[PDB]
Design a protein around this ligand. Structure first.
Ligand SMILES: CCc1[nH]c2nc(Sc3cnc4nccnc4c3)nc(N3CC[C@@H](N)C3)c2c1Cl
Length: 191
């Protein structure tokens, strides 16, 4: 399964250079965009964390957490563990954690180099809804660079806001000595 992704990442993300590093972000962001298209997500935050890890936060419905008859596993686990790019991001990260905010509960699971740490667990109560995915790209895969380009991300985030008119989407850099944030929103009929 995902071991094939770790051994031939070039076949899944096109490059293991800086281009592939940035592709990981879009693979997660695209899923949040799909949930905006479904009509439920209204805002997406992309964050470059101080350690060059990535957090993507949306306010959609939250990935389904119920057990599937075909797998006997929660749907959210399958999203990240079965090879449509979320599992690819998981495989090529040292760690990925998902929090699903749904029906008053926060459901949490984490993976390490693609492998499950523990069963999905309720860790908190919540009044919000959505999905938060955080990942640390694997330097064993991204041997050229693990350092993100804020302008590169910002440029595409702006493009995505335009193509998805009505969406709120932001990009934030939390790295030392260069903290920045840009927020984008193109108006619909209310304009
Ligand atoms: C933060 C990134 C994110 N946000 C996400 N938000 C949702 S919300 C959602 C999507 N589809 C549904 N279909 C049926 C019922 N509930 C749904 C909720 N789903 C997700 N899935 C599900 C399948 C795959 N596209 C990933 C994601 C993902 Cl990944």
């Amino acid at each position: 399964g995902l071991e094939a992704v770790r051994k031939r990442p070039g076949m899944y993300i096109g490059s293991t250079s800086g281009e592939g590093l940035h592709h990981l972000v879009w693979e997660i962001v695209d899923n949040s965009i799909d949930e905006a298209l479904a009509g439920f997500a209204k805002s997406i935050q992309v964050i470059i964390e101080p350690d060059d890890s990535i957090t993507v936060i949306d306010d959609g419905r939250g990935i389904p957490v119920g057990i599937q008859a075909k797998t006997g596993r929660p749907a959210v686990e399958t999203v990240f563990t079965v090879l449509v790019g979320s599992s690819v991001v998981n495989a090529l990260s040292t760690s990925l954690d998902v929090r699903v905010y749904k029906d008053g509960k926060v459901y949490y699971q984490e993976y390490r180099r693609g492998a499950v740490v523990d069963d999905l667990k309720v860790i908190e109560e919540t009044d919000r809804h959505g999905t938060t995915v955080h990942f640390i790209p694997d330097p064993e895969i991204f041997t050229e660079t693990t350092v993100y380009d804020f302008d590169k991300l910002a440029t595409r985030v702006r493009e995505l806001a335009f193509l998805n008119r009505g969406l709120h989407i932001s990009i934030e850099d939390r790295r030392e000595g260069q903290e920045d944030k840009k927020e984008y929103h193109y108006e619909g009929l209310e304009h």
